[PDB]
Amino acid sequence: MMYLTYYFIEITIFLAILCTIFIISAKNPMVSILYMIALFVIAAMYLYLIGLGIFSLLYIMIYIGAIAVLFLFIITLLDINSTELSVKSNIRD
Amino acid sequence: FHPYNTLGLATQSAMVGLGAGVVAAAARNSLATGPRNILTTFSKSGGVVTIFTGASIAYVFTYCSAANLRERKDGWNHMWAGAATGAVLGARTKLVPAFIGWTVLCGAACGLFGWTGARFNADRKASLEQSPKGFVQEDAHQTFWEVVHRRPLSLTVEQLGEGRGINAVPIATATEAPN
Numbered sequence: 197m198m199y200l201t202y203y204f205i206e207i208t209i210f211l212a213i214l215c216t217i218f219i220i221s222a223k224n225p226m227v228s229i230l231y232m233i234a235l236f237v238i239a240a241m242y243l244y245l246i247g248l249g250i251f252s253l254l255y256i257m258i259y260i261g262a263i264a265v266l267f268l269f270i271i272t273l274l275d276i277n278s279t280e281l282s283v284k285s286n287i288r289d
Numbered sequence: 290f291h292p293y294n295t296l297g298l299a300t301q302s303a304m305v306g307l308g309a310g311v312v313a314a315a316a317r318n319s320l321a322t323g324p325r326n327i328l329t330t331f332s333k334s335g336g337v338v339t340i341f342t343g344a345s346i347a348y349v350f351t352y353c354s355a356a357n358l359r360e361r362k363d364g365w366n367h368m369w370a371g372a373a374t375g376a377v378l379g380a381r382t383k384l385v386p387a388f389i390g391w392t393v394l395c396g397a398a399c400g401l402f403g404w405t406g407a408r409f410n411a412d413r414k415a416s417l418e419q420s421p422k423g424f425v426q427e428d429a430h431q432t433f434w435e436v437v438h439r440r441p442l443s444l445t446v447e448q449l450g451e452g453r454g455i456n457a458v459p460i461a462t463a464t465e466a467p468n
């Protein structure tokens with residue numbers, strides 16, 4: 197039982213890696229903002245793990261509650277074109 | 290002095306210069322204009338790889354070699370190394386005079402760089418701020434930055450040499466009458 201909650205921090209590390217790669221690879225930016233919200237949640241989780249739930253909640257009510265509301269509030273109103281992730285354009289890096 | 294290891298330093302220097310060529314190749318492939326890919330790095334690069342490797346090889350090989358042939362550590366070595374490096378870089382332009390010019394002027398610049406100490410930094414203890422200065426007190430040996438009201442004559446004759454007016458004893462007293 198004890199060690200079922202031993203590797204939660206490593207899980208959050210792996211999940212943050214995933215959400216970063218997904219922010220970078222997503223086609224429509226709206227999805228990239230949703231993955232940013234997933235990342236702020238994972239950060240709030242990790243902060244609860246190390247004993248700072250107050251900042252977890254301040255993050256959820258600041259970043260997610262305002263900044264990301266606003267990011268969607270912008271991309272909903274602007275004509276932000278894109279260029280889907282490719283191999284001819286980005287492999288060189 | 291303590292001798293240099295020519296081949297040990299040259300092999301390190303070549304791997305370093307190859308690595309710098311790889312970094313500059315990738316950075317050019319990213320910063321360039323037209324359609325490219327992971328293939329162009331070593332095909333369409335303007336000799337960044339051979340530039341860096343030949344320079345680092347020639348510089349370090351010549352510095353350690355001439356430091357060991359002259360058997361000293363000084364600025365003339367860095368001059369010879371900059372002379373080799375100028376030859377390598379100027380061989381790219383397939384002309385004799387530009388090859389000679391690249392050699393001489395890269396050599397003079399590296400030779401100056403060795404004159405001033407072969408560093409862009411400062412020693413910080415050989416400097417004037419952190420070193421004795423001003424008037425030496427009582428007959429003590431005159432260091433570099435120290436000033437002296439009256440110098441010894443033996444030290445003058447040694448540093449300069451005899452002749453051309455400069456002598457071990459003055460002229461009148463040398464030709465004074467023993468009376």
Ligand SMILES: CCCCCCCCCCCCCCCCCC(=O)OC[C@H](COP(=O)(O)OCCN)OC(=O)CCCCCCCCCCCCCCCCC
Pocket residue numbers: 305308309310311312313314316317320321
């Ligand atoms: C990977 C394995 C690693 C192996 C271990 C060892 C590795 C050692 C690596 C050494 C560092 C290598 C870095 C190479 C420099 C970066 C490559 C480059 O291209 O720099 C220029 C860059 C792009 O320029 P580019 O696209 O080529 O177009 C050229 C047209 N002008 O455009 C730029 O603006 C970037 C410039 C970067 C400059 C960095 C700072 C250099 C400082 C200058 C030194 C000056 C001091 C000498 C002054 C003497 C005075 C006479």
Ligand SMILES: CCCCCCCCCCCCO[C@H]1O[C@H](CO)[C@@H](O[C@H]2O[C@@H](CO)[C@H](O)[C@H](O)[C@@H]2O)[C@H](O)[C@H]1O
Pocket residue numbers: 414415416431432433434
């Ligand atoms: C074109 C003119 C202007 C160009 C700019 C350069 C001007 C400034 C002068 C550079 C002075 C360099 O001087 C530097 O080396 C001298 C030796 O020569 C050193 O002087 C020291 O050398 C050691 C031997 O190594 C001896 O003990 C010597 O008595 C002294 O203490 C100092 O550590 C430093 O002062």
